[PDB]
CSV table of C-alpha atoms and ligand atoms in Angstrom, one decimal:
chain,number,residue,atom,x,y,z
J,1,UNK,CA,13.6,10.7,24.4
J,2,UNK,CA,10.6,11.7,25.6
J,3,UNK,CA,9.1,15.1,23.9
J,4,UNK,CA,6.0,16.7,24.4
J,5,UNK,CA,4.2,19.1,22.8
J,6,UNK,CA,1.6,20.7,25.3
J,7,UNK,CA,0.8,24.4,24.3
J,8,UNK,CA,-3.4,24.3,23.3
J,9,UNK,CA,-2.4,27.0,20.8
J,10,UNK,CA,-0.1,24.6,18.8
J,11,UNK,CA,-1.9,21.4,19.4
J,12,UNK,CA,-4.9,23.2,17.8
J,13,UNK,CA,-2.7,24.3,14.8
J,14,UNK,CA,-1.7,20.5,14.5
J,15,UNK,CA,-4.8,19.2,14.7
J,16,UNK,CA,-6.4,21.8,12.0
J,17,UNK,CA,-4.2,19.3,9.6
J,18,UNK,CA,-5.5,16.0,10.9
J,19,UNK,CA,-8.8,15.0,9.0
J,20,UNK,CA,-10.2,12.5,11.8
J,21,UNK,CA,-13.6,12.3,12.2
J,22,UNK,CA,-16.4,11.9,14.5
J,23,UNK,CA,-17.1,8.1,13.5
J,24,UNK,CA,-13.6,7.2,13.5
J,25,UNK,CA,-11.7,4.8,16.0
J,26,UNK,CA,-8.0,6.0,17.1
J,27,UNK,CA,-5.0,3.9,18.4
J,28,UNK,CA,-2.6,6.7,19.5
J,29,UNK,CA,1.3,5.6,20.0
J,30,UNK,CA,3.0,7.8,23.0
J,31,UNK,CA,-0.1,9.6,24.0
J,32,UNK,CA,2.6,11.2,26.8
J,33,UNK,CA,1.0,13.7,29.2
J,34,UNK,CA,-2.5,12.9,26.8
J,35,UNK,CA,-2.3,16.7,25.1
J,36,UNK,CA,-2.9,14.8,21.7
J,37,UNK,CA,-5.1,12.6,23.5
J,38,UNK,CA,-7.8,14.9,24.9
J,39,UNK,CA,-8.0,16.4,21.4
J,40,UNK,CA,-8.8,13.0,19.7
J,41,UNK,CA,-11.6,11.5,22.4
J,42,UNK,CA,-13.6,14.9,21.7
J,43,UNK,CA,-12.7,14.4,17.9
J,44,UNK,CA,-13.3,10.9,17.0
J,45,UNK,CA,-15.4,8.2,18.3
J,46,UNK,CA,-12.8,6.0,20.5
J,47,UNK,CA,-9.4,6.3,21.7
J,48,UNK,CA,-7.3,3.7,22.5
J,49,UNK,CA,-3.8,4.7,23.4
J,50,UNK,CA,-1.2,2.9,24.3
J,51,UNK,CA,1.7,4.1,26.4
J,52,UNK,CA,4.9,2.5,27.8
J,53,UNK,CA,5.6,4.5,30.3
J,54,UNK,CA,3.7,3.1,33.3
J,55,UNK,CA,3.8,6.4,34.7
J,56,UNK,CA,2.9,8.6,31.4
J,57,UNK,CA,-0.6,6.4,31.2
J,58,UNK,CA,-1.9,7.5,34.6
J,59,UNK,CA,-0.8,11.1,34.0
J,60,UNK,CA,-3.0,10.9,30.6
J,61,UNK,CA,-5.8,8.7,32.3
J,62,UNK,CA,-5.8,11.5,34.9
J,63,UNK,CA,-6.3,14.6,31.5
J,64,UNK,CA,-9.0,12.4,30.3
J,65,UNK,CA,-10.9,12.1,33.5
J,66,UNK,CA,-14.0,13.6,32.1
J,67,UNK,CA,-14.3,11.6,29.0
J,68,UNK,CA,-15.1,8.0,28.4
J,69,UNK,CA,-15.0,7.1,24.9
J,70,UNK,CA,-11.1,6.2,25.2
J,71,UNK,CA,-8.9,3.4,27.0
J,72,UNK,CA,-4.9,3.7,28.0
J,73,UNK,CA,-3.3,0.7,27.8
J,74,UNK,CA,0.0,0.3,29.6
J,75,UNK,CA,2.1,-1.9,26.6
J,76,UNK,CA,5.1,-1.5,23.6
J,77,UNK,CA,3.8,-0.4,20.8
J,78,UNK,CA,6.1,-3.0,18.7
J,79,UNK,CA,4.2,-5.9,20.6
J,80,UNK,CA,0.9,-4.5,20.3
J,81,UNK,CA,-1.8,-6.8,18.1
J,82,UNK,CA,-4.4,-4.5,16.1
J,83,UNK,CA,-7.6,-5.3,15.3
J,84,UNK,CA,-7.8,-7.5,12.0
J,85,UNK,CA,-11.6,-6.7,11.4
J,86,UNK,CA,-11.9,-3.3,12.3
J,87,UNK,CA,-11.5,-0.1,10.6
J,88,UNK,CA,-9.4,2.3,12.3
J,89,UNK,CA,-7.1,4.8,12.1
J,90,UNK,CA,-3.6,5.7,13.8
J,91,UNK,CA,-2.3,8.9,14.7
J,92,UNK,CA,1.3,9.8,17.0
J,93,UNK,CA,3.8,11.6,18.2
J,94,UNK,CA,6.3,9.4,18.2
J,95,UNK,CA,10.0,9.0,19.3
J,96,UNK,CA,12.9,9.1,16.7
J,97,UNK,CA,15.0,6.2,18.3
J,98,UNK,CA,12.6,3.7,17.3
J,99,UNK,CA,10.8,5.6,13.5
J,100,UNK,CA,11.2,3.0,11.7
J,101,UNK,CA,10.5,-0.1,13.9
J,102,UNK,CA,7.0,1.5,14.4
J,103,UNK,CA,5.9,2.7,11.2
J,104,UNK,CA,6.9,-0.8,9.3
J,105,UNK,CA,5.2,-2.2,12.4
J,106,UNK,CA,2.1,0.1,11.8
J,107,UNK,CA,2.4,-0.4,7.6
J,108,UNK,CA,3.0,-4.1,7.6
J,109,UNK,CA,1.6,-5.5,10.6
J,110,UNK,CA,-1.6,-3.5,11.0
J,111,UNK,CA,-4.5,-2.6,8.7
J,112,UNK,CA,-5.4,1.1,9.7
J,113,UNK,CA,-6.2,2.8,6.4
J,114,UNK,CA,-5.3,6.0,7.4
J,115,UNK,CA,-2.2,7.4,9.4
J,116,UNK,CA,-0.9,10.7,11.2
J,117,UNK,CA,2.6,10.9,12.4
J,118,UNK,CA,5.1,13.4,13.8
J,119,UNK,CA,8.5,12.6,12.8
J,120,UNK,CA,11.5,14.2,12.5
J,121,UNK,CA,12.3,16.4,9.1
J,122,UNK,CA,14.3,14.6,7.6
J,123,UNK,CA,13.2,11.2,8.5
J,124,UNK,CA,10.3,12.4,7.0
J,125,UNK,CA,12.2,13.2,3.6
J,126,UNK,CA,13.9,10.0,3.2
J,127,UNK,CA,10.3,8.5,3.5
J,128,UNK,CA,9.7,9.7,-0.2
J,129,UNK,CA,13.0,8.9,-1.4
J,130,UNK,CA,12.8,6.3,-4.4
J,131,UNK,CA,16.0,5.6,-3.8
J,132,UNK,CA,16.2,3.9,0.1
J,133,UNK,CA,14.8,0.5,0.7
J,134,UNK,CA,12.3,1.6,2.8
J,135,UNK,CA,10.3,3.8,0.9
J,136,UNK,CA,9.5,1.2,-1.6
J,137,UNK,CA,8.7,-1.2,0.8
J,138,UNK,CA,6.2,1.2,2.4
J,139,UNK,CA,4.8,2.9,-1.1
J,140,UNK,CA,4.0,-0.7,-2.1
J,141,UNK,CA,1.4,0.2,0.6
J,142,UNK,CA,0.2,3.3,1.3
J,143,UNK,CA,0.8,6.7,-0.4
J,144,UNK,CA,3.0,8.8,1.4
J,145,UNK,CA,2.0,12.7,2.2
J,146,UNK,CA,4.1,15.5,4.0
J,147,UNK,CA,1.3,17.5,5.7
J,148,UNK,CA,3.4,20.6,7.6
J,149,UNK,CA,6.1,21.3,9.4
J,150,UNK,CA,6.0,20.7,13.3
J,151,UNK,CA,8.8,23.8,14.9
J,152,UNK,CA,11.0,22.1,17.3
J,153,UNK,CA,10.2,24.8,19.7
J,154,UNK,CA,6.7,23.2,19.8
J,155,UNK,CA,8.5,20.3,21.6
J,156,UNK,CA,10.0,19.7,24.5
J,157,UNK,CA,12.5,19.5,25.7
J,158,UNK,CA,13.4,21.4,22.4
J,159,UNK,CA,15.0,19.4,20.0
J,160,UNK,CA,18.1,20.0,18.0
J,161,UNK,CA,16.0,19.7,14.3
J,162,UNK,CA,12.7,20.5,13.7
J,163,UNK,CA,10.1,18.0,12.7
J,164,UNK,CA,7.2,17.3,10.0
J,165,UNK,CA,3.7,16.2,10.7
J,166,UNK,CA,3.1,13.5,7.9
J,167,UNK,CA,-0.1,10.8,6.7
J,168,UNK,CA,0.0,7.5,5.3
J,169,UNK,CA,-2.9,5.8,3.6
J,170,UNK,CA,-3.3,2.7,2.4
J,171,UNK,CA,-4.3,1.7,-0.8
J,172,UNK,CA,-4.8,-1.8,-2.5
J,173,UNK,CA,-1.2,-3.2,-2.8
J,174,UNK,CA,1.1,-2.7,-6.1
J,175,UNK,CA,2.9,-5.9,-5.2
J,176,UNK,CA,1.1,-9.2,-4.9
J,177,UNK,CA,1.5,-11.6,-1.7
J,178,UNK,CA,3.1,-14.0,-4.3
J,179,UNK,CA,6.0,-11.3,-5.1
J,180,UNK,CA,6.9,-11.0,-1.7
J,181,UNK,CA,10.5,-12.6,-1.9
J,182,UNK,CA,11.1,-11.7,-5.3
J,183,UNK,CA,10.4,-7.4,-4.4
J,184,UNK,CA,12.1,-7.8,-0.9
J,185,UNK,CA,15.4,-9.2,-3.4
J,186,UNK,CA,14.7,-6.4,-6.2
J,187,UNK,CA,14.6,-3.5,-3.5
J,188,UNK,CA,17.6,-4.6,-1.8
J,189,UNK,CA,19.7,-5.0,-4.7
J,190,UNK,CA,18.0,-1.5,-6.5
J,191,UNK,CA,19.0,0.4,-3.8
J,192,UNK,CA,22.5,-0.8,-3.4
J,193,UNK,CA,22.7,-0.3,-7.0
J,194,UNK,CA,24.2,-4.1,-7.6
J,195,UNK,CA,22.4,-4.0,-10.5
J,196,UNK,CA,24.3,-7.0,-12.5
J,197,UNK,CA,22.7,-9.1,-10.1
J,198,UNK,CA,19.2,-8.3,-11.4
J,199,UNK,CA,19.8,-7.1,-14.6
J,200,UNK,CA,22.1,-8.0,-17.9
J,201,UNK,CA,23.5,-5.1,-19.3
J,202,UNK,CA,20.8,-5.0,-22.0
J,203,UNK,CA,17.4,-5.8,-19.3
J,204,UNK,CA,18.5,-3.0,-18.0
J,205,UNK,CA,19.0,-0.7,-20.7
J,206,UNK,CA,15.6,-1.9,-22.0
J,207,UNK,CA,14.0,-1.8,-18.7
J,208,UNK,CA,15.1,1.9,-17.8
J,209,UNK,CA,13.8,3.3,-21.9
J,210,UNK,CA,10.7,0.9,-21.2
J,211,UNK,CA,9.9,2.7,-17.5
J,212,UNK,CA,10.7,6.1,-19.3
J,213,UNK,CA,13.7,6.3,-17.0
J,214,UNK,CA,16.2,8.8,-17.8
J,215,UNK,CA,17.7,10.2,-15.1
J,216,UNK,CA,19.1,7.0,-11.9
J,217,UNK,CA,19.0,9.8,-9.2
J,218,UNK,CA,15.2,10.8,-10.1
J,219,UNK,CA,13.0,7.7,-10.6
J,220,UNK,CA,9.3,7.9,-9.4
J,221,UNK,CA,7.6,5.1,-7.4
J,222,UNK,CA,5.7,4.2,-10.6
J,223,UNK,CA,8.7,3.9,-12.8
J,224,UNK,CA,10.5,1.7,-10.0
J,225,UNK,CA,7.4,-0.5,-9.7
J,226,UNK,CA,7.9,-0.4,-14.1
J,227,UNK,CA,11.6,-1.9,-13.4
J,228,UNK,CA,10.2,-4.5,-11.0
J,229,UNK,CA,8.0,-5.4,-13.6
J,230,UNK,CA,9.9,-5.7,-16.3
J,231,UNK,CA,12.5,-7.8,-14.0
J,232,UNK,CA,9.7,-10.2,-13.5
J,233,UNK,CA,9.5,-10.5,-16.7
J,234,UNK,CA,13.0,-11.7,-17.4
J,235,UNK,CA,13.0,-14.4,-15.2
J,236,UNK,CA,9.8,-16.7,-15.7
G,1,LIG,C1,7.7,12.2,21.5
G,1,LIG,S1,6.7,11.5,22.8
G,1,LIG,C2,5.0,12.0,22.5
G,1,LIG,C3,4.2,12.4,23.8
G,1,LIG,C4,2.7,12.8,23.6
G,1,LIG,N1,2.1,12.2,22.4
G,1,LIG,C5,2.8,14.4,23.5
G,1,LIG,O1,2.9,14.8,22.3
G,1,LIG,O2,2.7,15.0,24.5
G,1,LIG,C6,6.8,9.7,22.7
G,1,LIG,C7,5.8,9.0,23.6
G,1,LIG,O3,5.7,7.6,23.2
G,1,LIG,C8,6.0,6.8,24.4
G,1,LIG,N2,6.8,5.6,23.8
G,1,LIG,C9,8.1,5.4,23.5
G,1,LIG,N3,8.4,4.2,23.1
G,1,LIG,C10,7.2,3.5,23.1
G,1,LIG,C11,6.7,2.2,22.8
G,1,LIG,N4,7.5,1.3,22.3
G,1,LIG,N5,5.4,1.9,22.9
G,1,LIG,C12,4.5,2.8,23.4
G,1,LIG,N6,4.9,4.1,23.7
G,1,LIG,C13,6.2,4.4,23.6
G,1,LIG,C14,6.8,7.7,25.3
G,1,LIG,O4,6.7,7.2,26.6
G,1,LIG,C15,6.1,9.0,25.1
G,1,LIG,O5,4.9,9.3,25.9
């Protein structure tokens, strides 16, 4: 639920991985008891971080007391409105129960170009699987990286499985606002393999010896965004 991760010695072994700089602005999701918190006000530029837990926010106001280039704002991450002229960053520790919610809400509805989460291991792996739904809607987006592996005994209380420090960047989107329907229909049916409904069973022949596709259980994101292509193609 709530896992923290407050030995210096390990904080400082994450943060060796995290490439912020002086210049940069931070939102943090779940700055907890503020242990990532203190590291990133005398790190980057500003720090706004944005807690919850009602409680949790004076606990970290209270570790920052003798800085002043950050700002804890009591409020749910999933309702929080970023900054649509500003560049900025995102790092966080966050809570497995709600992964997904907050990194589509961090991908889609925000415009940091550069992200650092901790996540479990193996939510982690199935961000880089071609072959779930939302991988594809998040590579369309930013390029996926699997920095290190975070021990669960770093947390606590200590989790059952350990987890993986990973960083998202964003990059000009593969798929154009006008695709929007059309990808969010291909990816659905792709994944669920219904492939008759996109594809005749020549289109997709084609399609797979066109994107270089031999092998269903190993496609890269650049094939897959070959099959969406080729799918557009087909129809208008
Ligand atoms: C795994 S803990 C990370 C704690 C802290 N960053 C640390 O490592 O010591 C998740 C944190 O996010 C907060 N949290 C959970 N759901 C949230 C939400 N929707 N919006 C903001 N914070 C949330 C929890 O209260 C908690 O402080």
């Amino acid at each position: 639920s709530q896992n923290f991760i407050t030995s210096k010695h390990n904080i400082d072994k994450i943060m060796t991985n995290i490439r912020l700089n002086e210049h940069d602005n931070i939102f943090e999701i779940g700055s907890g008891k503020g242990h990532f918190t203190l590291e990133l006000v005398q790190r980057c530029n500003f720090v706004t971080a944005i807690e919850i837990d009602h409680k949790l926010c004076k606990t970290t106001e209270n570790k920052l007391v003798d800085h002043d280039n950050f700002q804890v704002l009591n409020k749910d991450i999933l309702q929080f409105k970023f900054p649509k002229n500003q560049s900025y960053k995102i790092f966080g520790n966050i809570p497995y129960n709600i992964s997904t919610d907050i990194i589509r809400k961090i991908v889609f509805d925000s415009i940091a170009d550069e992200i650092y989460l901790i996540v479990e291991y193996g939510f982690a792996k199935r961000l880089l699987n071609t072959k779930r739904s939302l991988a594809l809607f998040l590579m369309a987006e930013v390029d996926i990286s699997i920095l290190s592996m975070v021990p669960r005994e770093y947390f606590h209380p200590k989790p059952k499985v350990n987890s993986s420090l990973i960083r998202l960047n964003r990059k000009k989107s593969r798929i154009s606002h006008k695709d929007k329907q059309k990808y969010n229909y291909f990816v659905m049916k792709w994944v669920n393999k219904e492939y008759k409904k996109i594809f005749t069973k020549n289109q997709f022949n084609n399609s797979l010896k066109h994107a270089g596709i031999d092998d269903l259980n190993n496609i890269s994101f650049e094939q897959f965004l070959s099959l969406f292509n080729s799918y557009k193609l087909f129809n208008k």
